[PDB]
Design a binder for these strands. Sequence first.
RNA 1: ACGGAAACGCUUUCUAGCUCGCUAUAAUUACCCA
Lengths: 121, 121, 251, 345, 217, 216, 107
Amino acid sequence: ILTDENYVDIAEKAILKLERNTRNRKNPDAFFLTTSKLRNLLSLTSTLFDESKVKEYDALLDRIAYLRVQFVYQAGREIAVKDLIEKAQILEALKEIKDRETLQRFCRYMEALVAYFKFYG
Amino acid sequence: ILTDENYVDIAEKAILKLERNTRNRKNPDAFFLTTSKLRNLLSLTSTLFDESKVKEYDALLDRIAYLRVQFVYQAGREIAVKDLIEKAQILEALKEIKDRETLQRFCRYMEALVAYFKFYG
Amino acid sequence: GLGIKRLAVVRLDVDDLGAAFMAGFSQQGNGQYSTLSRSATFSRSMSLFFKVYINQFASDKKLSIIYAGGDDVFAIGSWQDIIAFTVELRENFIKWTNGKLTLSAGIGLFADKTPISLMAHQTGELEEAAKGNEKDSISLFSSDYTFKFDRFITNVYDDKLEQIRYFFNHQDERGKNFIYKLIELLRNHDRMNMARLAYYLTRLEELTRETDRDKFKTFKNLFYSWYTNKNDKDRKEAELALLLYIYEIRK
Amino acid sequence: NDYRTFKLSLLTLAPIHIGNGEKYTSREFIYENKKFYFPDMGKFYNKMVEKRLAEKFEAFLIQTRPNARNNRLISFLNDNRIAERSFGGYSISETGLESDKNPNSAGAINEVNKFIRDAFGNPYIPGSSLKGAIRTILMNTTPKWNNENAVNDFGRFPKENKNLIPWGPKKGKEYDDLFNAIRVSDSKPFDNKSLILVQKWDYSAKTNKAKPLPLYRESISPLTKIEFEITTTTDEAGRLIEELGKRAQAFYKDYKAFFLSEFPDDKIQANLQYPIYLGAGSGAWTKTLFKQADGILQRRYSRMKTKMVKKGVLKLTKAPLKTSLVKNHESFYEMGKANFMIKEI
Amino acid sequence: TFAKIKFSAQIRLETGLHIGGSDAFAAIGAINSPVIKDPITNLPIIPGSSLKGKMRTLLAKVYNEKVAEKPSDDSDILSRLFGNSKDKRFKMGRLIFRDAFLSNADELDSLGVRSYTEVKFENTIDRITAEANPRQIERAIRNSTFDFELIYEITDENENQVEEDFKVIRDGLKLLELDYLGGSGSRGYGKVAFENLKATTVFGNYDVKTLNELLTA
Amino acid sequence: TFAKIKFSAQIRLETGLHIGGSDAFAAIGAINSPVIKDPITNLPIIPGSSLKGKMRTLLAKVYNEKVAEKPSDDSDILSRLFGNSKDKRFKMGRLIFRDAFLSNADELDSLGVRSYTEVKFENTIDRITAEANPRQIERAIRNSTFDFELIYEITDENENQVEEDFKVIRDGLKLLELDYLGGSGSRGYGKVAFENLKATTVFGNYDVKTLNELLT
Amino acid sequence: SLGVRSYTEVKFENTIDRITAEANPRQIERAIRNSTFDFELIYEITDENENQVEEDFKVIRDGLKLLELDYLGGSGSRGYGKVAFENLKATTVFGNYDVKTLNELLT
RNA sequence: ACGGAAACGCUUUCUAGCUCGCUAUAAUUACCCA
Ligand SMILES: Nc1ncnc2c1ncn2[C@@H]1O[C@H](COP(=O)(O)OP(=O)(O)NP(=O)(O)O)[C@@H](O)[C@H]1O
Ligand SMILES: [Mg+2]
Ligand SMILES: [Mg+2]
């Protein structure tokens, strides 16, 4: 679960819980997860965060249902996105949206994940 | 029938209900159904999903008529696909499409099926 | 030609001077230093300072002392030479009083061609808004920038402002757009802007050239460090420092 | 103006298939004349639902009947007297060599792969497919691009480095991008009368047979001239795309000595111009760095259909005789063995 | 004096082009690289930014003597026809490259066009292990034409800069026919023709008799 | 007597318009330059200040003898129509531009438009290094219309300059068509067309039947 | 309830030089659209002016159509106006005066 | 017989200028199942 006071801190401590490249000493402690397997997932929630400011929540429930498909699919392809969305409980944060406010909270959570992914390594 | 708040969950509990290799105890919990025969099902609707955005539904629905027969014929060849189209009520949901927002929900439901099948296995 | 075309007004007051005059000397000894001679020499000291030495402190600067005496200094002038005037005045007054007798000013910026009562009243409101910070404070330009002087002259005006000026003159890539985007992230500041600032400075760390990259890294590890400090007396200082650096380089 | 344009000419010795991803199923054609008619099956089902027989059609699609000439949607129309065949798609003439059985088996082909087509409907060769044929000739015949193009001890001997050839924006560096400087155009969209749908014929070593496969891709007929335009904006790119004549000969020389030997020479064509292996059915060794994928290519196959020992089965087909290209009997072409000649404009 | 003229053309495609779109809500097995298209008719557009930043850079390798290394280092024949950000007199730049919308939709409907954009499947063969990576990228179809507006300003700074800038604009257009408008380019995807070059004045007084002759050079 | 004239027109877009709002620090993958939008309905909007300022600078290229160094240095033909901070008599000059508020949210929703703005992804390519830098800028979609209106007042200080002013107003709208009106127009945005030009007298007594034929 | 965070929007704006062509930004705080404000306007029917009340009602009312047709605010030549009165009723408070001959002249 | 009477925080002002959604990438591999 994520609330209005702690969604940035979970995205902080979830990048730190994501395991890095222990071996392959060429700029070590790099992540197995790559940037472009993460900007694709943000590319959905960014275009929901910009539609939630205008359109009502009872018109966005076709895209909000498909975030649950895309996170599942991108985790099924590569193990690093699986290690992301199981460390950061994204599939249990997608279960709880229900209105505009928690939707925008999740869409800011997905951005805080990327900001702290960029900030570390 | 499948609607916006439940079709991803219907796909999730569909994929868990496909039977597995009860024998062949070499990496068990492996489906009879494979990734190729399921992407052959998603490739039927992947054209209609992006022809639905441009064209009207009334100038399109003969392909939606023939796509029922396509799912029938892809079911009538392998028993692991005839099993799939009855666990997930695909043939029952093809008859209840009748507009654009259910065509883009069925073609999205097949994407949900592929996503959870890739996620499990 | 660099510098915003504003004039500042400062109004000062030595905090609790009547308390420092009547009681005054009663703490050391056992009431043995509470004579009339100590208070007479104290009056001569305070009168000597506020009637002789303020003209020494206002020597080179572009200002006008509209009143000085007792314990008030009301002075109009150019804003660089008002902020420099009051930093100099207090850093000499706390040497003059060994660090006793706090004074607490209010500086306000005003554009050209504005009436003088509309100017002086808004300065005096900043002065009384700095009387009640705790007691000893300077109130730069507005009701919110209210700093203790020991938390202002060391931290804002000498530490942070010179670090900001030192970074932003030894380069050419980063400009005033970067400073404006830092002022916005400093002023709004929820917990989300800590992540957005951590993303912004890391984007710009890998956008600067490899000649000036440790120069930018020692600036972003210095700005992100006080932004996320969790004491609130280090983030508010940086906003006033960046306001002063933008006011210095205005065309 | 360093836009040095060239003019490649491509002569197909062997049948060439490219693209489209999709494929017609077993019940999506009509063979009643000596042509194959591939309709628009949407319009087929639309015009057949007037015949009130769509449920018998759905019975025909799951009908597990033997005698495959009665399964292929011809007998559905001959028995139920649908004879208009005014539907959408197109027709192609036969190879004549598809059904090996002279006992009837006519139109008993099963699953054809479509050819790449524009939205007008006419076939062409895409420039991105011809550039991948150019790029392997450039990679194998350049010894600096063959050493470390490999694992670096990461996973299951997994993949190409993709960074031996210096590619990128590369922040802080100038802009090289050698294959941005090799600009290959799509061809002129040629005609439907060049397509024959050869089958597939896998010809093995150490067991001298030619077992055929159920995979009958819609390839181009041999001896079809197809033109291409290539512009090279870097002089470094201009050198390689001029020296393709030497490099294609060198690639075919290093590939015959590696792979076409251990196969009998009667089934192997001669070049007659500069050799090139355009896609879909030329084998893996024409799409890869063949002298660097000897213990790395076959590792991917622990399945029912593994590569035999090493240097996998040859990919012949059966298209009819022209000029002569074949050099043997029984019409065994090589499925992708084309040629080119280049000249600067 | 003030004048404002207009260049009409037709961007006839030749092996049609990709100009990449935006949506992340695409699919699983369908188009992952959309073309930019008009949000109401769902017809492909050639946006004027992709015309402008191809002409601005192709002429930069011709008319800049000193290599630019940055925009607004252009050689004042490009800085005034496109606009700097940093020259005090060349902030605006007297050319308006309007967007281009697909004109001949009925001519394409006379041909056997299923849909106005084709989808092209383009896997990446891993040059070791021979494995693939399919992309399904969308491109506007081959014989599409696009109406190409181009509006030019003539103020009281054009003493003799008018006819000099038209051995520059048509120079850039005949350099667009040697390059590729974005997409892949190195994989086809870009070749255009400019048809019916027809200059006219939409505002003011200017004599385009002497201009409508070097369009047909 | 004192009169007023109202100018109904539909601002129909082509090559959809961008009028920028906040340059405030956006979210991480969000829209970078958003269009100006209404706070209540969250539709696009054209403010009257853009329509006034762009038409002011366009008519400053036609109706000025000497090149104006500043808007106070504009002509007497334009100061009476757009106001002047320095003339004693041409301060608050005779035109009230109003905003425009996306009249056909029902015509656009009859067609398959999902949102009344599109977001075009876009980039710049460096000259050396050819390294890409994307932006996402928002723009009100192509087939919008906008309810445009002016309130031209007649205060009897002109008495014959009335029909001289519509040869400036109609000329300014004709220039706004040919120029772009708003945002990145040299990359082909804006491109407004003016439809249904109709002058009505909403206060006072003035006849406009000889004026609509000037508006054609 | 219509969905908004503040009752005042911040409109960004600028000023472009005619020669240098360099902008000069601004943030102008406007009240938002369809805010509805209270309004009352006491007219005192005193003793002397009894014959001239109705010719001071065709002037109060005529001064409201003008505010609907002029801007009523600051910087209103650039939008920022267009203020329309509604439910314009005239009741009587502290008096004995019949306003059923006026409320039809208003609506 | 109200430190009160009369008084628009008002006029002017384009969120603007510049910027390629771009870079690399054969729809290909394996040959078999009953
Ligand atoms: N040298 C002096 N000796 C004695 N009294 C003095 C001297 N200089 C000023 N004063 C008087 O001391 C009083 C202090 O006034 P004021 O500053 O208002 O009070 P305060 O003690 O400072 N409390 P605060 O206003 O909160 O700082 C005034 O009446 C001054 O006239
Ligand atoms: Mg005091
Ligand atoms: Mg005092």
